[PDB]
Amino acid sequence: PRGAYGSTSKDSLRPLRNRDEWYQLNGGIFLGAMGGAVFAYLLLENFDALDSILRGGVNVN
Amino acid sequence: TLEGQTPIFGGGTGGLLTKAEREEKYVITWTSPKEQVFEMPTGGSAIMRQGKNKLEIARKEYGIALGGQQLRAKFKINDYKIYRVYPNGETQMIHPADGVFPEKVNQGRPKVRYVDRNIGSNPSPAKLKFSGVQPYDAP
Amino acid sequence: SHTVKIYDTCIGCTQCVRACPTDVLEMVPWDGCKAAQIASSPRTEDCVGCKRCETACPTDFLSIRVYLGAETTRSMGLAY
Amino acid sequence: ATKFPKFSQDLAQDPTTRRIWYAMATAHDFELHDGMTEENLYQKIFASHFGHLAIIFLWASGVLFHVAWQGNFEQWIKDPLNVRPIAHAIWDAQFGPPAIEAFTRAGATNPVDICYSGVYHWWYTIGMRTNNELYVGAIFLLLLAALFLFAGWLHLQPRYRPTLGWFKSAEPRLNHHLAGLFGVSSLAWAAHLIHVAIPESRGQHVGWDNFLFTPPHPAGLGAFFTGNWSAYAQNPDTAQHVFNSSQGAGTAILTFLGGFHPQTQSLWLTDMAHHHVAIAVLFIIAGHMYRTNWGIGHSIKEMLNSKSFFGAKVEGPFNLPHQGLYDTINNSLHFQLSFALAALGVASSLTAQHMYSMPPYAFIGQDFTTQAALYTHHQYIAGFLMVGAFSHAGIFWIRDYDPEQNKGNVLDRMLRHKEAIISHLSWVSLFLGFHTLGLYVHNDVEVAFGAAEKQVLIEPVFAQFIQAAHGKALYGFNTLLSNPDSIASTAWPNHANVWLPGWLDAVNNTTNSLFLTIGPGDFYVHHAIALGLHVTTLVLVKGALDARGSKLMPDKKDFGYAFPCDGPGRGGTCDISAWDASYLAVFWMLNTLGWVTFYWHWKHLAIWEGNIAQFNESSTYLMGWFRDYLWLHSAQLINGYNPYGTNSLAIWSWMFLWGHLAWAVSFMFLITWRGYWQELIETLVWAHEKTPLSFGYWRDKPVALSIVQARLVGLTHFTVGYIATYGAFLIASTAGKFG
Amino acid sequence: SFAMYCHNDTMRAFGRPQDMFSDTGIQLQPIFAQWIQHIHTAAVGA
Amino acid sequence: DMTQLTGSYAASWLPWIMIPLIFYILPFPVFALIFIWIEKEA
Amino acid sequence: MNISDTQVFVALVVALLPGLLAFRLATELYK
Numbered sequence A: 001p002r003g004a005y006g007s008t009s010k011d012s013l014r015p016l017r018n019r020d021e022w023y024q025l026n027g028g029i030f031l032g033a034m035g036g037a038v039f040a041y042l043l044l045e046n047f048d049a050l051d052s053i054l055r056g057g058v059n060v061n
Numbered sequence B: 001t002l003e004g005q006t007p008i009f010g011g012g013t014g015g016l017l018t019k020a021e022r023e024e025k026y027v028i029t030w031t032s033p034k035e036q037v038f039e040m041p042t043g044g045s046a047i048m049r050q051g052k053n054k055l056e057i058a059r060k061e062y063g064i065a066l067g068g069q070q071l072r073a074k075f076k077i078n079d080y081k082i083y084r085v086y087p088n089g090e091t092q093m094i095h096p097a098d099g100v101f102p103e104k105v106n107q108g109r110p111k112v113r114y115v116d117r118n119i120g121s122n123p124s125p126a127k128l129k130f131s132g133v134q135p136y137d138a139p
Numbered sequence C: 001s002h003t004v005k006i007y008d009t010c011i012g013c014t015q016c017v018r019a020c021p022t023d024v025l026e027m028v029p030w031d032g033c034k035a036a037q038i039a040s041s042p043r044t045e046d047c048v049g050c051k052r053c054e055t056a057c058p059t060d061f062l063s064i065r066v067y068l069g070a071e072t073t074r075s076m077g078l079a080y
Numbered sequence D: 001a002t003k004f005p006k007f008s009q010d011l012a013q014d015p016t017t018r019r020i021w022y023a024m025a026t027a028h029d030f031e032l033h034d035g036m037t038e039e040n041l042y043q044k045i046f047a048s049h050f051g052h053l054a055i056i057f058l059w060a061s062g063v064l065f066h067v068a069w070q071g072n073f074e075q076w077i078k079d080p081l082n083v084r085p086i087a088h089a090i091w092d093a094q095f096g097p098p099a100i101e102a103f104t105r106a107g108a109t110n111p112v113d114i115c116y117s118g119v120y121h122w123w124y125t126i127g128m129r130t131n132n133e134l135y136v137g138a139i140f141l142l143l144l145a146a147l148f149l150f151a152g153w154l155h156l157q158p159r160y161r162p163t164l165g166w167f168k169s170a171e172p173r174l175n176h177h178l179a180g181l182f183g184v185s186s187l188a189w190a191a192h193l194i195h196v197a198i199p200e201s202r203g204q205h206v207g208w209d210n211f212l213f214t215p216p217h218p219a220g221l222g223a224f225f226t227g228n229w230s231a232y233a234q235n236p237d238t239a240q241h242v243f244n245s246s247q248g249a250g251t252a253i254l255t256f257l258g259g260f261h262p263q264t265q266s267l268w269l270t271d272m273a274h275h276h277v278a279i280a281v282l283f284i285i286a287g288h289m290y291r292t293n294w295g296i297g298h299s300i301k302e303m304l305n306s307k308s309f310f311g312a313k314v315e316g317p318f319n320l321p322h323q324g325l326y327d328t329i330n331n332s333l334h335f336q337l338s339f340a341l342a343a344l345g346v347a348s349s350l351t352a353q354h355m356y357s358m359p360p361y362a363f364i365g366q367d368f369t370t371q372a373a374l375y376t377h378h379q380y381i382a383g384f385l386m387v388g389a390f391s392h393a394g395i396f397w398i399r400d401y402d403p404e405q406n407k408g409n410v411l412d413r414m415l416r417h418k419e420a421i422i423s424h425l426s427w428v429s430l431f432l433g434f435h436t437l438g439l440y441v442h443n444d445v446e447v448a449f450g451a452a453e454k455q456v457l458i459e460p461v462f463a464q465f466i467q468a469a470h471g472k473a474l475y476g477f478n479t480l481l482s483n484p485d486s487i488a489s490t491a492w493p494n495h496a497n498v499w500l501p502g503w504l505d506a507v508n509n510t511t512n513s514l515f516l517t518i519g520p521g522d523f524y525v526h527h528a529i530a531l532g533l534h535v536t537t538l539v540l541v542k543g544a545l546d547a548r549g550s551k552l553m554p555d556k557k558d559f560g561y562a563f564p565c566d567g568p569g570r571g572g573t574c575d576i577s578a579w580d581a582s583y584l585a586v587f588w589m590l591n592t593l594g595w596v597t598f599y600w601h602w603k604h605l606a607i608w609e610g611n612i613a614q615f616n617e618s619s620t621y622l623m624g625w626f627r628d629y630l631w632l633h634s635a636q637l638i639n640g641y642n643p644y645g646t647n648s649l650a651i652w653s654w655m656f657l658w659g660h661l662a663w664a665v666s667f668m669f670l671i672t673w674r675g676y677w678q679e680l681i682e683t684l685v686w687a688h689e690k691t692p693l694s695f696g697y698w699r700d701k702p703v704a705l706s707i708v709q710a711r712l713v714g715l716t717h718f719t720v721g722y723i724a725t726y727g728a729f730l731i732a733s734t735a736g737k738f739g
Numbered sequence E: 001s002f003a004m005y006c007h008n009d010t011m012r013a014f015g016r017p018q019d020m021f022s023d024t025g026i027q028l029q030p031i032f033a034q035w036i037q038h039i040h041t042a043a044v045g046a
Numbered sequence F: 001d002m003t004q005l006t007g008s009y010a011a012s013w014l015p016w017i018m019i020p021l022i023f024y025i026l027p028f029p030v031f032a033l034i035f036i037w038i039e040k041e042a
Numbered sequence G: 001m002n003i004s005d006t007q008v009f010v011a012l013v014v015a016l017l018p019g020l021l022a023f024r025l026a027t028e029l030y031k
């Protein structure tokens, strides 16, 4: 590879020197991004229930 | 390698653990005049064979207890030896260290950790502040 | 490891060596007592600190002293 | 080995869970750290003290901020006698609607806690009126804590690390801490009372915006420099003065009236200003006693080493050899810490004994729960400080005392008759215990058998005489201040008893706690307190004096302050170290302070009820304490929640049981000992190794807690349960029956 | 056994009796002991 | 109303988020930090 | 009349100064 990802490059800030590492990183990135987006979406979609939760309003009944 | 036949034992829960395979293990070997029943150091009874035996034990105190209080005191067996076995395979014989039992004085043994005074003359800790020397280690 | 020291009041009765459950002590030639022998502690790495040796010592005060120190696997008496 | 702990390779090489436990226990024992020098010891301590000071300032900032943010300080100003001060808001998401309603009170629209620390009364007396003033104080303390945090870092940089000689210079430190830290601070506080607090108590606002051009007295500073100091005492606050208003308000800034302000039932603000003025002068004078750099001044080393009394040959002060002591204190940080802890312990006891009897804050004497909380808080802290004074005294004997440099001096003499000291302390404890308990159970049997007239009821005549000598005419004695014709009351040469009319009014007032009437029930409990004081002293003194050694362990000094035992030999040596004596003494300190706070609380409960006769007739036998104090006053506490609902006492109910639970857990650590648990842990170690799907494995081998660690952990649960159980009962039994 | 008592104390203190382990909340009926009582009563004909 | 946790004080939404953060959100990451600190090899 | 939203936010920002200095002192004492 050209530049910082060549064999002789000593770039300590760019340590993923293998293609397989990059593909595994990409798979993790996609799955984690989808999971985090869905987690935020679920928290926001249930914001009324979660706001009652964090104020103790679910303990009326 | 350590030679000898393991005593007849059906298995127990007080045997070796991960420490035997990871850090160290101990082996006690002895010769008996006959087949007889002895007590395993960690519970249960085992049958020592007619010839020479070999028992694997988790701690050195097990060998001293078995050899000292059972083999010597009860079965009149005085030729037991304790080895320390490391995971790499290195084996060293540790008891009796020089072939003579420690309670019997043997020539050539040096004095180790001997203090040339009575215990009441140890210096006060205030004299040895910030020096790192304990009162019992003071000259 | 624990530290085991032997002082000059030892009378060479061999009782501390016999009482040791891990063979830390042995008896060595000496001339300071009638028995012509004194206790030694060459194997303090195997000392557990039970202080059985101090219990067996007949002199007053003790001719053998155990000072509990850094704890290791074998000093803690751990089979695991 | 592990990096943690950085200060001990012996612990860092420990392969068991004991390594983590002991790292936290010995982290602040700087002297035992690897490669620790004396100079590095003092420098690390000096920076540590900066951190502790910053923590105190942050703590005070948090108290101010939460009151200004969520409290009701401004509402409480308008009616201090009927408005409940608010500590902070409650945000517990597990609350139900009944709990939310129960804790929504004191005029708030959200759940809140009721402040019982007295900070509302304190800030009100010192002239704070608005939440913005509290907020500015909170912000100021944040910056002050930042200043001390930076100072600690600065004095660790290589150029600013003080030398060991700087730390050892005792005379300049005493001069600056007496004249400056005690004197100038007292003078500055008196300035705050004169310039701010007193004008604010008269309806006049004085702040940073107008204090430069608003004189505190009409005579100005001219009266001070011309010698006309009496102008400051003219026209004091009238007996009809209304606090925080100009109605009936005088102009004097330094009076010496004595007694209490008739409305607030607290000490006069102008009296407190003159108090800190006179205290400042005395301490500034005291700060010039020792020589630093100009020849004049005493040398403490010379005074201790002196052997001539105006020519006559003497052993020393009071004909007692004090030589060699200067180096003993100056080289022993534990000796210095022992005096500092003892002085703070006595000061904390004096705070508790004097704040309830002479309330210094407006209307704080009428906040019954606050009064009980403050007295119990400062007495228990005093007991802990007293234990620490003797604990570090025992540490001094082992670590810092050497017989050679103290040969023949007064410190060596004490060690040479320790048996006489310990045996006589044992006799006093036995005499007090046998007769105090014996008289209780004698009264128990008589009252139980319907013969309450057959009780032994010794009158506390000696203490009653002291109260009469202070002006209490209730007992009918006619001595000293209770006798108007006595030379003490008249002060015949000068008649300068301008304090006496105010003092006598407060003394003979039946609505305050100034010299509460005492009878036979008070006689017995003080002898219970004397028993507790002497036994706790006996345990602590015996541990300190036997720290070097005893017949059972002649060489105890070579083993350190805290070791488990010396084995089962020689009969057995459990709890033989000096640390163990401090461990045992905490049990007696808790018991003694229990008797002290039980007595204070029950006596004040009877007075506040209007049922003083209950205490007078029931405190003479132990069943009266158990029935009319414990059982009787627990009723409303244990009904904070029940099958019918919850009220505001539900927290004190839950914490009451929480303290009992922590107390019970301590018994496990204290009764069961290590070898039982080590064998059990070994069995669990086997189970884990043989169970599939349990991929976890210990990096540190699980071991039972050490012998010493068990005593400490058990003592901690015992103490925490002790404080939590009584604190919940103290708050609930007083706040449930009053404001 | 015991930590559910602590659960009950906290629920009752919170003013949440419906979350308690009780006959009126989360019920824990000893059905096997109740069954034995019914069997032993019906054995004699009662 | 007294059926929910509320606050009449300024920024009453602060306890709404700070109580979860300090008590059951951050403490486990904090324990993880300390655990890594006390287990690091020399 | 208790403090306002701005005052609470100002106190939070101001508290960062002792917060960072506490970290500096703690790490310095660790040396």
Ligand code: F6C
Binding pocket: D684, D687, D688, D691, D693, D694, D695, D696, D697, F028, F029, F031, F032
């Ligand atoms: C790590 C890993 C591990 C593992 C895996 O891997 C395990 C496993 C086992 C098995 C085998 C068994 C069964 C289980 C049960 O049931 O029980 C438990 C429970 C639980 C729950 C446990 C727990 C589990 C795990 C831990 C999980 C974790 C997760 C989390 C969430 C984390 C979190 C984190 C954050 C940061 C906080 C057991 C047991 C026992 N343990 Mg055992 N573990 C361990 C850990 C631990 C520690 C630390 C300690 C101390 C505390 C102990 C303790 C104990 C005791 C006492 C006992 C008993 O008894 C038991 C037995 O033996 O039988 C028989 N052990 N274990």
Ligand code: CLA
Binding pocket: D089, D090, D091, D092, D093, D094, D099, D103, D113, D650, D651, D654, D723, E009, E010, E011, E013, E014, F019, F023
């Ligand atoms: C499942 C049980 C449970 C749990 C987990 C909580 C959790 C909580 N409650 Mg709570 N509560 C409960 C049951 C429970 N409650 C019940 C049954 C009641 C009665 C109905 C209450 C009544 C109640 C009130 C009235 C209040 C709380 C508060 C709180 C919060 C503060 C944390 C705490 O209590 O101390 C946890 C303690 C610590 C984390 C310790 C901090 C670390 C310091 C440095 C220790 C220092 C020790 C100290 C110096 C030595 C002692 C000093 C002492 C003598 C003064 C927290 C959200 C308070 C709140 O709203 O907080 C914002 C509050 O005001 N609760």
Ligand code: CLA
Binding pocket: D024, D025, D026, D027, D028, D029, D030, D337, D341, D384, D385, D386, D387, D388, D389, D391, D392, D395, D561, D562, D579, D582, D712, D716, D720
């Ligand atoms: C200003 C006061 C002061 C100072 C500077 C010291 C300083 C010291 N003491 Mg000391 N002490 C004091 C007051 C003080 N003490 C008091 C009042 C008592 C009586 C209770 C004691 C009783 C005492 C004993 C019995 C021992 C010491 C020891 C020590 C030294 C080592 C500290 C240690 O073990 O690591 C730090 C230790 C800890 C952090 C202990 C953990 C906390 C304990 C268990 C309390 C439980 C926490 C509780 C639940 C909540 C508290 C609030 C939380 C934030 C911690 C150190 C020089 C030890 C020593 O010198 O060994 C030879 C020792 O054995 N002290």
Ligand code: CLA
Binding pocket: D426, D427, D429, D430, D431, D432, D433, D434, D437, D535, D538, D539, D584, D585, D587, D588
């Ligand atoms: C209710 C609990 C209780 C009681 C009554 C005692 C009693 C005593 N403790 Mg003690 N202690 C306790 C709990 C208790 N402790 C706990 C929990 C601890 C923590 C471990 C300690 C730690 C401790 C230490 C460290 C020390 C004491 C000391 C003392 C003695 C000093 C008081 C004294 O002489 O009074 C007089 C004696 C008594 C009141 C005891 C009762 C006497 C009985 C009632 C006489 C009855 C005679 C009768 C014929 C008996 C019937 C026959 C029967 C044998 C079958 C005394 C024997 C000190 C000591 O021994 O100094 C002399 C001491 O150094 N104790």
Ligand code: CLA
Binding pocket: D427, D430, D431, D432, D434, D435
């Ligand atoms: C029903 C009445 C009653 C009872 C049952 C007791 C019971 C007891 N008293 Mg007691 N006492 C009482 C009334 C009573 N007292 C009265 C009215 C007084 C006068 C105020 C005293 C004054 C008193 C003192 C001064 C002492 C006791 C002691 C004792 C205990 C041992 C007494 C004994 O003979 O041991 C058997 C006797 C011996 C083993 C040796 C003799 C001990 C005596 C008391 C001292 C020698 C007498 C001599 C004149 C020196 C006096 C010293 C004194 C001036 C300080 C015992 C628990 C002693 C105690 O608690 O010890 C710890 C103790 O020293 N009592």
Ligand code: CLA
Binding pocket: D462, D463, D464, D465, D466, D467, D515, D516, D517, D518, D526, D529, D596, D597, D599, D600, D603
């Ligand atoms: C730890 C708890 C504790 C302690 C130690 C005390 C201790 C004391 N309380 Mg007390 N008290 C407590 C808790 C406690 N209390 C509680 C919880 C309450 C409930 C609120 C009370 C309520 C209370 C009241 C209401 C009174 C006391 C009083 C007293 C004192 C009695 C004085 C006396 O009779 O001596 C008698 C001594 C003499 C008559 C002296 C005789 C001559 C001697 C021998 C001197 C001889 C000349 C001398 C050598 C020369 C001087 C030399 C000098 C310069 C060195 C005493 C100091 C009384 C007191 O005086 O308070 C100030 C008092 O009226 N207490």
Ligand code: CLA
Binding pocket: D055, D058, D059, D060, D061, D062, D063, D065, D066, D088, D089, D090, D091, F014, F015, F016, F018, F019, F022, G011, G012, G013, G015
């Ligand atoms: C030491 C002082 C102190 C103490 C004990 C408390 C206590 C409390 N605060 Mg608080 N607070 C303080 C100062 C303090 N405050 C200051 C100075 C500010 C302004 C920045 C705030 C701002 C604040 C907000 C905005 C909120 C609280 C809340 C709370 C409660 C829940 C805990 C929480 O969420 O923390 C939150 C803490 C912060 C946002 C910052 C705290 C900053 C202080 C100075 C840190 C102190 C660190 C301490 C000294 C080091 C301990 C050392 C260790 C050995 C013990 C609790 C009653 C919550 C509440 O009211 O619930 C009902 C809440 O939402 N606090």
Ligand SMILES: CC1=C(/C=C/C(C)=C/C=C/C(C)=C/C=C/C=C(C)/C=C/C=C(C)/C=C/C2=C(C)CCCC2(C)C)C(C)(C)CCC1
Binding pocket: A031, A032, A034, A035, A036, A038, A039, A042
């Ligand atoms: C530097 C710093 C800082 C900052 C910080 C930050 C920037 C933070 C952030 C943070 C964040 C931003 C975080 C986040 C997180 C996240 C998470 C935690 C997530 C989770 C998720 C999940 C759990 C998911 C799940 C899932 C999946 C996976 C699939 C299916 C679905 C679900 C949803 C289930 C500050 C200034 C403060 C201070 C100073 C320092």
Ligand code: SF4
Binding pocket: C006, C009, C010, C011, C012, C013, C014, C015, C016, C017, C038, C039, C053, C056, C057, C058, C059, C062, C063, C064
């Ligand atoms: S028991 Fe004591 S006297 Fe006997 S040999 Fe050992 S050290 Fe010497």
Ligand SMILES: [Ca+2]
Binding pocket: A058, A059, A060, A061
């Ligand atoms: Ca619900």
